[PDB]
Structures are given as structure tokens and as C-alpha cells.
Amino acid sequence: QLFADLSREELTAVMRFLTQRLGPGLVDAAQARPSDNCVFSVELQLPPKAAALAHLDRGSPPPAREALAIVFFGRQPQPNVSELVVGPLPHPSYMRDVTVERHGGPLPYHRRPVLFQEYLDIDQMIFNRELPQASGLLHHCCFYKRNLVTMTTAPRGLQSGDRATWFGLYYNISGAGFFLHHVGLELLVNHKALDPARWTIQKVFYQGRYYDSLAQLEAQFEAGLVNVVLIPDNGTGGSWSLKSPVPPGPAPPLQFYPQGPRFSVQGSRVASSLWTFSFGLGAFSGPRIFDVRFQGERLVYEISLQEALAIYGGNSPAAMTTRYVDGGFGMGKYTTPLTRGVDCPYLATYVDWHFLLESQAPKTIRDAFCVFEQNQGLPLRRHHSDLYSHYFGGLAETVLVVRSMSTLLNYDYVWDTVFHPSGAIEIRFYATGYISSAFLFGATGKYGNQVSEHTLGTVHTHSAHFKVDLDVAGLENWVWAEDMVFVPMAVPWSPEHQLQRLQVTRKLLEMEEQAAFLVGSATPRYLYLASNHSNKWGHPRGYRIQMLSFAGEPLPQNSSMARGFSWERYQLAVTQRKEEEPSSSSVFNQNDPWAPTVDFSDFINNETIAGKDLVAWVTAGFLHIPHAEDIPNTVTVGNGVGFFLRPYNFFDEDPSFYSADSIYFRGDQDAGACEVNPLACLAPDLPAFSHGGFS
Template structure:
């Protein structure tokens, strides 16, 4: 079956309706699931903005700019046609509003316009179903507000307006150009498989050294994995991205009001073709993704997901023995990686899902691309750093939400925490002295409210989904959740839109799995955050979490204060967050001991002999460089 979403704008009560259609690939039935999923009809004003709507808005803005010709010539060396608009969101202050600030930038071909604001922003009311009734409500320029572009022009002509005169940027000298400044050097190291890939991809299913994964891509919420198994046992039923929030600060209206919920724009839809040899290893397996949005024909983002085995150049484990007996044992850390990259306006998010040889799953997101910016005026540096002549890199936070439906040794799990404490005890062999002895404090959490850990608050260092069944050593078979994050502060709960992103209150929340709670948010929350279609906080209602089918909801993120080194792009170094799912007493020993890549040799062996040491075989197994296919990139074809 498939989900079809229709916008009915011409009905007596305009609305959004969702249908399940099937069976695939030749549907013969459909049923309305809107009430079942949301408890009622979804109001029409909550719909995401379409490409056609943006086109109509731009046409309105261009008409309004023509009313200020002398001002535009003076401020920007422009007639308006070489200025580009950037949307903000949400769109207003209350349910039913569809009023958006658009920030204007110099548009320079071949480079990111996001770093070239001209100081002009316009507020457009585009909520009416009749296009002719759309209006430009306000204009902002360099710290001042005006009722219209005509009023702005009148103030300028009267000499009552302070204008910052900007030159039209040149392509060869524009701030943020990514064009190379040095000639190409010799190629760096390449990663390749000397005897071909050791993983298998068939349709949407991957197998690799005991791992089995089904993968997919939702056009809006992005990458999602299902039925993750290791050695035949399911570890995770669903691992999926839910939402990406970018919340900004500025002393300009567009920047200060921006709270992007990227799922509304299309995290999966805007995952474009990956560049071989840079976005992913040259010899990775590249997979096309298909979707149907705002069209009656499907679209294909070719090669928009990649799969590869990665040699991290780090041992997974190793030991060199220099006492009693002399030997070396170890195993390379080779990891299966599933990757896709979403370009959401200015930012590029790199989504990684990694599968390790010890049964651990790693989820990681890196942010790169262009920062968003405001025109520098007044006390702008209270909200960021100056990164150009008139450009303020505006502070913001990135918060990312994931759903992790773990099934640890079956569907019925409980939640256990462990942490350390100190106890002061008399020294058993010297009673006049005391020892500060660390001990382990274990606790089973019984209710959802106990398992909702506030963002940035102290949390037990070990949190595990545990099975009722023990391993060989009589400990519950478990998987540990380990979060790597340095998130910013969550929006205050007093905010009128906070409930729409209430998942961000928690770094981790564990709830009972329910079919009626499939996602932590909705694509409709962006344009009506004041009456959210899905409110995650309502999922947490103190139900029991002992021996139940449980879901972990994880928030990771970071605060980003842009600085000079974010020009031209934010780098991935230090801008990666995520989490691990690690086996904890799930096995009787590290399962990687069975890896055929294991290495062991002793001082009594000829370590240069291929039979004694697999590493000695590499020189003969990889004598020839691989034949690399010709470089190809067609990512611009479908734009």
C-alpha cells in the first residue's frame, strides 16, 4: 500500500485529505485515513508551501519592488530582477495565518546568495484562496519598518532614509565563492575493494557480515530503516529520521522569526545525486530514489543514496602482548555505511547509518553547506558574528529527532539505567583508613514519565533496553543507547508554538509503541505550529514500560554561532552528532571474534607468511590498482 496526500482547496471546507491506496503496483482501492490518523480533518492552511505558490509570491514581490526604483538603484545597483527571496517559517503568529517574511539577497550565478543580504525584507500575506487578494503587508530595511515599498521609496526620495550602498557582487570576488583557488594537486588516498564489495544489495535490502537491513526514503521525513537484524535476530524494527529543526536569532524580522521544520520542506525529496569520490567513496554502490510530489508523474533522484564498506583506519580491537608471551591480536574496524545527503535551502545534512562488526549500530548527522545570514545593522553582533562587509552570520541551533523501535531479543522489553556512586568503607586490611569505593547503581524505570529525560539535563550514563531473557552469565540481554550531542536550549514551553516541537524537550523519551503514534511530528506542524497536528508531548502519559513493546525517541543537536571560518561553508569537523545502539550483555562475548578479518600472530611465527598472517597476503591480493569507472554526474538534470 501507499499513502496519497491530496490538497482540496476548492471544496466548501478546504482541507487536506490522506488516503491509503493499494494494492501496489496496481491500486484498486482507496480509503480515507485522515480522521483515523489525526482525529479530524486537517485544515487547508496547514499545507506545505508548493513550488507554484513560491512562484506566485515571487511575482508579487517583483511587482512591489517596481514601486521603489530609485531606492533599489541606490541601495543595491538593482532594478529588483537580480534580487532573490529566501522564505522564512513559520508564517504568522496564530492558527490560520499564512503571512511570511521573505529576505532579499543579491543573486550571483554559481555561488551561494545566502551570504549577500541587501538589508531589505518583505512581509507577504498569501493566505487567501484568491491570488488577487495577496498583499505585501510590511517592508523592513536596515532597522526600519515601512507600510509598503511605495512608502520606502517616498522616504528615500525625501532624503529621510539612511541607505547602505552596496555594489552588485562580481562572480569572481563574491563572498562565499566555492570556486577553487589553487590548481589540482596529486590525488589523495582512495578506498576500494580489491576483490569486489563484501556486501550485497538487492532491491531495498542489504546484507553484510551478519547484518541484514531494509532501507527506504520518505520524501518528507527522509531516510528510514526497517527490520535491522544481526546474526538472524532482529535488533531494531524501525530506525527513522523524524524531524530537523533549525531555530535562528537575529535583529532582522526574517531571521528572528525563523524556526524551520525541514520535514515540511522535504528531507527525502531534496536528497540529490551524490558526487562519487567526494560525497561517498568512488566505488560505493549508488541507489536511485523515486517520489511523487506536486506532480502527476514520479520523479527520480538518481544515485541519491550510497552504500559502502568503510575502513576507518582504526582497530575495532587490538592487543600487543609484551609480557609472559609475545603476540599480537586485532581486528580492523570495517563498517557498513548507508548515506544520503539532503540540501535544505542553504544547509546540507549528511545522514549516516553505520553497522559495526561487534553488533553496534551508529547513527550520525553532519551539517555543512552555507550559513544563513542577516544584514548587519545596529547591535547585530548580539546574535552572531560579522563574517562579511555587511553580513551577520546568525546564531542558530540544529535539533534532530529520531525514532528507534528496538526489539531486543523479542518485542517485550524494559528500561534499565546504570550509573556510578561512591561509598565510603573501612579499609578491610587497614581499618583506621577508609576507601572511596565506586559501586554500580541499577534501576528499572517503570513509567513513561520516569523515562522522559529533559534536554541537557543529567542523565544516567548507561540506559538500556533489556530483555526478560538472560545471557550465559545470567545478565539480561540488552542494547544500550549512547547519545553524542551538544544541543542548544529548547524553545521555552511558554512559547505559543512550543508544543509543535515538544519532542525537543527531551534528549531521550521511551514510550509504549502504538500504531496511532507512528511519528513524533507532522509535515503540517510547520505552517500551523500553534495548533499542532501531532503533539509529541501527548505521547508521554505515564503508562507502564515494563515488559512492553517500547520505542526510544532521541533528540541530538548543536548550537552553531557562525564565525569567519564558516565562509564559504560550514565544515563537518566538530559538527557531527548522533547516537549508538550498543550490545550490552546481549551476547556471551564480543561477536566480532568470529570475523574472518581477525589477525593473530606470535613471536614464534613467521609474520611475513601469508598462512600465518592475513595482512601478509595483501601485497599479492592487491597488486593492481582498481579499474575506476568514468566519472559521471547527472544531478542537475531534474532541477
């Protein structure tokens, strides 16, 4: 299993090694202060592609199996973040610092994600030292005494090098989302200092007005210059609960496998009579799929989530300057247990996921993946003939699915990899869970809708970026753009007459820039990566990229931070796959987008894409103005974005023709005979329910 994420054992063994090589003074990241040395991340380092294909397709031995550790080196004159590759696994022997090799220099220490212990320190400051200075105001507005909690925001500051975060204050609602109860107080905390003692509060926001400290605010209030409204800290309805007041009814439909599962899961490889592939989670990039072979032939080397991005508006400071680059938190790191029956079909197969993050010992997110077959209740294809000959032929589409979900504070991102029996691959991304809210005060008409009492549903956009490493019939691929045109010309057999003549238009895209399409501008209706090899009928074997996106307007290029997610400007882009261009974002962009650790636009640089090993990059998104129907959560309906990889002259005929599940009968046959029709042929056992728990 070349692409399997690191096991608990491998994780442990690399942490063992790291502790030896870094002579103590090394602290457990779970309790580390800024000036300490700690291990932040330890996870699988993906192998180089050539070495891997060598192994998979030519017997050649397995590329060394290595880990990548992210270390916070704060205990030194010039602190920094280092990426260290760790030696041959199962039993590590070397350690290699690749930081400069990759970035050209050190990683500025301020790009390091805010540690859990850091958030904790920030809270101690706010709750123990800063808030009690306004115990007057906070008593008359927010039942102060703790009853409140904080939620961090986007990039932290305004220039490269800043580490100042706007926090909102929310009623600490129990058993339900606190995100819907902003109490109207927002704090700009400056925690750039290595000594948490020197941490200050640069700004304060309350009801439309800014102050320089809480004392200054508490002042204006004791001076009777601030009007306070007692925000209720309790209620009933969707705003306050997630539990339905309605008794359970008869159960929803259930799918089972009459003659047992028709696929198997072995570690991280999945196999069905049609598909074999590997799956996993990057701690920061999230879901990924490797070595996808349809009936033994490889279509894609890699499909992987690169980044998720949320961009906000609002009439409060926190909201209006919020741009989450979710990889900076980690789609994998924040993956949550799948609730059997709700998040996946009850009889799905559920797999665990192991990680060493902000810790010194491995941990496991139980039931992190689900794999299952799903009857779509829909024909993959069908024809019914009443004309000339009486026959029916069709096939009910069943689909193979791998899924994980990431809960980043509020939102719960659902990541779907769907394998169709037609030879097609579908990548879906559903955004559910809670919205972010602001306190409703002022002229909120331009920044969202009132979505509850005191609650503003702030306008925003969601986008995600995907890496699509297709290797259509080998590595050397070309990209084609086919479309249509009408050409007015005389009717051959009656030349006085005209006719708008429909024509196909093909165009080879030979330079990276030609296959870079921007959000906003139109893209060709047919776009695919081809080999020079042809199918039986002499057409380039190709796989077509079809996008499902309602992408909202991307953050303006003029923004000094826009280059921390330059991929958001592109619908689709295609480039030469390079070992040095592994991902299009980085865990280090979130905290310093002004000095991006990777800038996707760098990948598009006047190179040829004619006959190379290419890699496609797809962006999918939508705009979101919140409405009442988002209370409790936002629903998945309509907000599914992503793309299809559809075969296009790749095969000689539709592979599903050879399906073991296809149905066919003529008029002169007994369609109710089981030897004519398998449908005419012929008490699920259900495991005890169990939940992954919490942390």
C-alpha cells in the first residue's frame, strides 16, 4: 500500500526518532508556548511519482516510505518553522530538512498555525484580564459574571508578519451551535509576541463603534453614552436547538446488499469488479484518491482536495475582514466521525483514520471514512422499443462512494468521491453545518439577512480547489477544446434557400496559459485531456472535465492578500505536473497570505502542455447570502459543487454494455422468467449501532 496514510505504529516510531535527534527541551505541542520547540504535524510524505509508477507498473522496489514533520522552533535567537522528512519506515534511520529546498529560505515563524494552547492563552487573557474591565456593560447586555466563548477569524492582521486576530464573543450555548449568538462584542487581539505576557488588545468593537480598549468602552457606558439591550441567553426553536420536537416516525428507506457487499476495503485500497483505487486524508489538504484503475487500466494518478476558502462581508470588523484558508486549520486534522445511518448509509463500511497532530502520541478519528455501494434509483441507461422491433434494454445505475467530512468550527464540509459504472468519476463537495453570524445592529441590508432575533447571516462565498492528475492512457497528455458554431450557408439541394449549419470546432491547447480559464469568462463546452493514442475508431483517447460550479466573484486581484489563494481566480487550469509543484496551497498561507508560502498562479508560466504529463486544477464554489432556512444548519440541497471526469472516446464502446447487472428482453420472451431476466429472480442483518465519540 504505497499511498496508505501513516499507521499508529509508523506515527509513533517517527515521534520516537524525532525525540532522540532533537535533544530535549522539546515540548508537547498540546501545551507548548510560542517560545518552545514542538512537533506540530507528522504525516505521510507522498512518494515521488516516477519511483512509484516504477514500482506499480514495472516490479521495481517500493520508494522509501517517509514522513513529513512540521516543527515549531521557537526556542532560539531566530525562531522558525521547519519541514523535516523522516527516515526509511517502519524503522526511521535518517532525518532531512527540506525547508530551504522547497521555499528558498526559512519559514517565518508567524506563518505557523495558531496552536490549540495558543487559543487557550488568548482566552485566559480575554476572560481573566480584559473582559472584567467591562463587567458593567457586559452585565447589562450579556448576563456577564463564564458564559461566553470566542471564535477566531481569517488572516490575522493587515500586513505580512502580523499576528492579530479578531475574535467574536458568543453565548456559550450547550448542546447546540454557539455560532448563532454573537453578543455584539469583537476584540482585535495582538498575539504576535513570543511571550504571551506582552499580548495586547489593539481594538474593540461594539455596536457599530470602535474603541482602543475595554476600559475605554466600559467608560463610555458608565458615562451613559452607550445604549445597552439585554440579549436573551436562552430560547426555543432552530436558533437554540438541533433536536427535533417531533416524535420519531416510521423509518426512512434502507438499502442492503441482497447477496452480500460487492466491493472490499483492505487498508486504504478499495476494489470492485470495476474499480480499484486508494484513499486517504492529508492532515491539511484533506481527501485524496490515488491510482484509480478502471478494469485494470489507470485513469488518474491522483485526485485530491487542495484547499477550501471562505470569503466574508459584514458591518462588523471580524466578519468584514474574514477570509478563511481552511488548509491552515486542516481538512484532515478536523475530520469528524461519521454517524452511521445519517452521514452515510447504515450498511456502509466505516474506516478509521490515525494522526499525530499537536500531540506526541498518535490518535484516531473513529469512522472517519465510509465506503459503500448506492443504488441511485435511476437508470444508467435504457431504451424501450415499440418501433419495428419489440425489446427493452437497460441498467439501473449503482454507484461506488468514498466519503469523509470536515468540521471546521462551524461548517461541516462533506467530501464525496463517486465512481460510476460508465467509467466516470464524480467529485462532490457539500457544505452543511452552522453559518457564521454577526450581531444584528445598524444598516445590515448590504451584508446579509436577519436570520434570527439579533442574528445577521453574513454574506460570503465558499470555494474549493481540486488537483486532478489524469494520466489518460499514459503520462503524455494533450488538452483539447471542442465546442460548436453555426455557419450560414446555402441549402445544397435548393440553393436559393439558407440554413444555419451546425458544426463542431476543435482546438489544441498547447501552452499552459491557453488552458487557464478564469472565473467570469466562458470556457469551451467540451474540454478534455487526451493521449496521442486513439480508440478503435480513430479518435484521441480522452477524459473530459465537466464542472459543476456556481462560482461567486473571486476576491479582487488588487487585494494585497489575494495571492494566498490565487487559484480562486480560475475555473479550471492545466499545467505540467512537477514534483516541486505538489499542492496549490499550504498550511502556511492562512496566517500570512500577503507573503504566500505557495502561490498557485506561479504554476502557470508559459510552458508547453502538448505531450507532457499534465495535471488539471479545478475550482468549485458558490455565493451564499443566508436566509432563514439556514437556521439550525444549511442544507445540502442545491449546494453540491465539483466536477465529472467523463470518458470521451477513451473506450471503444460504453463499458457498461458488458455489465453483469444489465437487463434485456424481447417482446416474444417471458420477461417474468428468471432465466430471461434476473429481476424476476427469487431480512438484512444489521450491526449494532455505535458512535465514534468526541474529543
